Write a protein that binds this ligand. Structure first.
Ligand SMILES: [Mg+2]
Ligand SMILES: [Mn+2]
Ligand SMILES: [Mn+2]
Ligand SMILES: [Mn+2]
Ligand SMILES: [Mn+2]
Ligand SMILES: [Mn+2]
Ligand SMILES: [Mn+2]
Ligand SMILES: [Mn+2]
Ligand SMILES: [Mn+2]
Lengths: 70, 102
Protein backbone atom coordinates (compact mmCIF):
# COMPACT_ATOMS: atom_id res chain seq x y z
CA UNK A 1 0.00 0.00 0.00
CA UNK A 2 1.80 2.99 -1.30
CA UNK A 3 -1.23 5.23 -2.07
CA UNK A 4 -0.41 5.27 -5.82
CA UNK A 5 -0.57 1.51 -5.79
CA UNK A 6 -3.74 0.93 -3.82
CA UNK A 7 -5.32 -2.48 -4.45
CA UNK A 8 -8.82 -3.28 -3.01
CA UNK A 9 -9.42 -6.70 -1.56
CA UNK A 10 -9.91 -9.46 -4.02
CA UNK A 11 -13.53 -10.08 -4.73
CA UNK A 12 -14.77 -7.12 -2.86
CA UNK A 13 -16.19 -4.41 -5.12
CA UNK A 14 -17.79 -4.91 -8.54
CA UNK A 15 -19.04 -2.20 -10.99
CA UNK A 16 -22.68 -1.20 -10.53
CA UNK A 17 -25.11 -2.03 -13.34
CA UNK A 18 -26.06 0.88 -15.56
CA UNK A 19 -29.29 0.18 -17.35
CA UNK A 20 -30.53 2.18 -20.28
CA UNK A 21 -27.13 3.10 -21.70
CA UNK A 22 -27.05 1.37 -25.02
CA UNK A 23 -28.18 -1.99 -26.44
CA UNK A 24 -25.04 -4.11 -26.61
CA UNK A 25 -25.01 -3.66 -22.87
CA UNK A 26 -28.09 -5.86 -22.85
CA UNK A 27 -30.40 -3.30 -21.24
CA UNK A 28 -32.28 -0.65 -23.50
CA UNK A 29 -36.02 -1.38 -22.98
CA UNK A 30 -34.15 -1.38 -19.70
CA UNK A 31 -36.41 -4.06 -18.28
CA UNK A 32 -39.95 -5.43 -18.70
CA UNK A 33 -42.00 -4.73 -21.88
CA UNK A 34 -45.45 -3.15 -22.47
CA UNK A 35 -46.87 -3.91 -19.01
CA UNK A 36 -46.55 -2.13 -15.60
CA UNK A 37 -42.89 -1.74 -16.40
CA UNK A 38 -44.27 1.81 -16.48
CA UNK A 39 -42.48 4.34 -13.97
CA UNK A 40 -45.01 4.37 -11.16
CA UNK A 41 -44.62 0.59 -11.42
CA UNK A 42 -46.70 -0.39 -8.37
CA UNK A 43 -47.04 -4.15 -8.22
CA UNK A 44 -49.36 -3.60 -5.27
CA UNK A 45 -47.01 -4.38 -2.37
CA UNK A 46 -47.86 -8.14 -2.02
CA UNK A 47 -51.23 -9.19 -3.59
CA UNK A 48 -53.24 -10.80 -6.51
CA UNK A 49 -57.01 -10.09 -6.60
CA UNK A 50 -57.85 -12.59 -3.83
CA UNK A 51 -56.07 -11.54 -0.54
CA UNK A 52 -54.49 -14.74 0.84
CA UNK A 53 -52.23 -12.86 3.19
CA UNK A 54 -55.40 -13.11 5.23
CA UNK A 55 -57.23 -16.16 6.69
CA UNK A 56 -58.13 -15.99 10.40
CA UNK A 57 -56.48 -14.76 13.54
CA UNK A 58 -55.25 -15.97 16.92
CA UNK A 59 -53.58 -13.68 19.54
CA UNK A 60 -52.93 -12.11 23.02
CA UNK A 61 -49.86 -11.00 25.17
CA UNK A 62 -49.07 -10.14 28.88
CA UNK A 63 -45.86 -9.17 30.74
CA UNK A 64 -43.24 -11.97 31.28
CA UNK A 65 -39.96 -13.55 30.06
CA UNK A 66 -36.53 -14.53 31.51
CA UNK A 67 -32.89 -14.92 30.39
CA UNK A 68 -31.38 -18.39 29.77
CA UNK A 69 -28.04 -19.66 31.18
CA UNK A 70 -27.51 -23.38 30.42
CA UNK B 1 7.03 -25.16 -67.27
CA UNK B 2 4.60 -24.75 -64.43
CA UNK B 3 3.20 -27.01 -61.75
CA UNK B 4 0.15 -27.47 -59.57
CA UNK B 5 0.69 -28.02 -55.79
CA UNK B 6 -1.86 -28.81 -52.97
CA UNK B 7 -0.80 -26.46 -50.17
CA UNK B 8 -3.48 -24.35 -48.42
CA UNK B 9 -6.85 -25.91 -48.04
CA UNK B 10 -6.39 -25.44 -51.77
CA UNK B 11 -4.36 -25.98 -54.93
CA UNK B 12 -1.87 -23.58 -56.47
CA UNK B 13 -0.26 -23.05 -59.86
CA UNK B 14 3.34 -22.02 -59.79
CA UNK B 15 5.85 -21.18 -62.48
CA UNK B 16 8.87 -20.07 -60.37
CA UNK B 17 10.48 -16.67 -59.88
CA UNK B 18 6.90 -16.08 -58.92
CA UNK B 19 5.93 -14.78 -55.53
CA UNK B 20 3.13 -16.82 -54.02
CA UNK B 21 0.81 -16.26 -51.12
CA UNK B 22 -0.32 -19.27 -49.13
CA UNK B 23 -1.73 -20.13 -45.67
CA UNK B 24 0.53 -19.49 -42.72
CA UNK B 25 3.13 -22.03 -43.16
CA UNK B 26 4.52 -22.51 -39.62
CA UNK B 27 8.15 -22.18 -40.78
CA UNK B 28 10.83 -19.51 -40.47
CA UNK B 29 11.18 -16.20 -42.24
CA UNK B 30 14.23 -17.08 -44.35
CA UNK B 31 14.17 -20.86 -44.62
CA UNK B 32 13.32 -22.56 -47.93
CA UNK B 33 10.15 -24.65 -47.93
CA UNK B 34 9.66 -27.64 -50.16
CA UNK B 35 6.09 -28.42 -51.19
CA UNK B 36 5.36 -32.18 -50.99
CA UNK B 37 1.98 -32.47 -52.76
CA UNK B 38 2.39 -31.82 -56.50
CA UNK B 39 -0.55 -32.76 -58.73
CA UNK B 40 0.54 -32.07 -62.25
CA UNK B 41 3.46 -30.49 -64.03
CA UNK B 42 3.16 -28.64 -67.37
CA UNK B 43 5.65 -27.49 -69.99
CA UNK B 44 7.38 -29.22 -72.92
CA UNK B 45 7.33 -32.53 -71.01
CA UNK B 46 4.27 -33.14 -68.80
CA UNK B 47 3.74 -35.42 -65.82
CA UNK B 48 0.10 -35.82 -64.73
CA UNK B 49 -0.10 -37.51 -61.34
CA UNK B 50 -2.77 -39.62 -59.70
CA UNK B 51 -3.01 -37.90 -56.56
CA UNK B 52 0.74 -36.82 -56.47
CA UNK B 53 3.12 -36.93 -59.42
CA UNK B 54 5.58 -39.24 -57.55
CA UNK B 55 8.87 -37.63 -56.52
CA UNK B 56 8.89 -33.99 -57.72
CA UNK B 57 9.37 -31.26 -55.11
CA UNK B 58 8.49 -27.68 -55.94
CA UNK B 59 10.90 -25.47 -53.85
CA UNK B 60 10.37 -21.91 -52.59
CA UNK B 61 11.93 -19.52 -50.14
CA UNK B 62 10.00 -17.91 -47.35
CA UNK B 63 9.75 -14.14 -47.70
CA UNK B 64 7.17 -12.83 -45.26
CA UNK B 65 5.00 -14.33 -42.58
CA UNK B 66 2.27 -11.72 -42.56
CA UNK B 67 -1.29 -10.64 -41.83
CA UNK B 68 -3.61 -9.28 -44.44
CA UNK B 69 -5.69 -6.13 -44.43
CA UNK B 70 -8.16 -5.97 -41.65
CA UNK B 71 -11.71 -6.54 -42.72
CA UNK B 72 -14.50 -5.79 -40.23
CA UNK B 73 -17.20 -8.37 -39.98
CA UNK B 74 -20.32 -6.37 -39.18
CA UNK B 75 -23.77 -7.83 -39.01
CA UNK B 76 -27.27 -7.06 -37.90
CA UNK B 77 -30.82 -8.26 -37.58
CA UNK B 78 -33.02 -5.43 -38.60
CA UNK B 79 -35.56 -4.16 -36.17
CA UNK B 80 -35.04 -7.03 -33.69
CA UNK B 81 -32.33 -5.29 -31.63
CA UNK B 82 -29.01 -6.97 -32.35
CA UNK B 83 -25.76 -6.12 -34.31
CA UNK B 84 -22.31 -7.71 -33.89
CA UNK B 85 -18.90 -6.40 -35.06
CA UNK B 86 -15.55 -8.25 -35.19
CA UNK B 87 -12.32 -7.21 -36.96
CA UNK B 88 -10.33 -9.87 -38.82
CA UNK B 89 -6.91 -10.10 -40.38
CA UNK B 90 -5.83 -13.41 -41.83
CA UNK B 91 -2.31 -14.67 -41.37
CA UNK B 92 -0.29 -15.70 -44.40
CA UNK B 93 3.09 -16.58 -45.89
CA UNK B 94 4.60 -15.10 -49.00
CA UNK B 95 7.12 -17.38 -50.57
CA UNK B 96 8.86 -17.14 -53.91
CA UNK B 97 9.49 -20.23 -56.08
CA UNK B 98 12.80 -21.68 -57.28
CA UNK B 99 13.42 -24.90 -59.21
CA UNK B 100 10.07 -26.72 -59.55
CA UNK B 101 10.88 -30.49 -59.74
CA UNK B 102 14.47 -29.62 -58.76
MG1 LIG C 1 -56.12 -11.12 8.96
MN1 LIG D 1 -20.53 -4.65 -15.70
MN1 LIG E 1 -31.13 -8.97 -24.45
MN1 LIG F 1 -42.07 0.61 -25.81
MN1 LIG G 1 -44.52 -7.07 -18.34
MN1 LIG H 1 -39.30 0.02 -15.00
MN1 LIG I 1 -44.96 9.13 -12.85
MN1 LIG J 1 -52.95 -3.40 -1.27
MN1 LIG K 1 0.45 -24.29 -36.89
Amino acid sequence: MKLHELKPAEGSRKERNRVGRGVATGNGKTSGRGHKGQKARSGGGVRPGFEGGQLPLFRRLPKRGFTNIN
Amino acid sequence: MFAIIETGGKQIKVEEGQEIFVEKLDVNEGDTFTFDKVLFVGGDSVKVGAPTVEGATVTATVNKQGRGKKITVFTYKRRKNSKRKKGHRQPYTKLTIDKINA
